[PDB]
Amino acid sequence: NTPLQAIGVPVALYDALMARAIDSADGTPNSKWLVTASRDLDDGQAKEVKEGI
Amino acid sequence: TLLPLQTIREHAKCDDNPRVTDDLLKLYREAAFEAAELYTGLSFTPEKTIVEPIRLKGRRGKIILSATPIAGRPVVFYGGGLGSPLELIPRPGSNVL
Secondary structure, three states: OOHHHHOHHHHHHHHHHHHHHHHHHOOOOOOOOOOOOOOOOOOOOHHHHHHHO | OOOOHHHHHHHOOOOOOOOOOHHHHHHHHHHHOOOOOOOOOOOOOOOOOOOOOOOOOOOOOOOEOOOOOOOOOOEEEOOOOOOOOEEEOOOOOOOEO
């Protein structure tokens, strides 16, 4: 008769949830400003757009 | 001597079936040479020797060169607190150093 008999369900929920936390911490891009060009932009000046921004 | 009248005619199909005469064609050429090179900005530019007052931009000094030199010849910088001249081999394709 110990408290450990009735906490298996919650402790599993915690370790599963914190595993979700640590997993999504590294793996989700931390970048902003998804810039995309149009088709006709002449790489060679499209890079000029990149260095400018 | 840059754009022959016969070349203009053979491009624009005015060949053996004539539109407005060579007088209007040469006027059109003289007025198309003021729309081009004015929309783009370039000049006659033979082998050039561009000297230009370059303006400090930022604490680290972006230097945009107004003519993007060829690929690797050292552009020289002098004056404006520069007691001694100095060369810099620039970017090919771009002109920001």
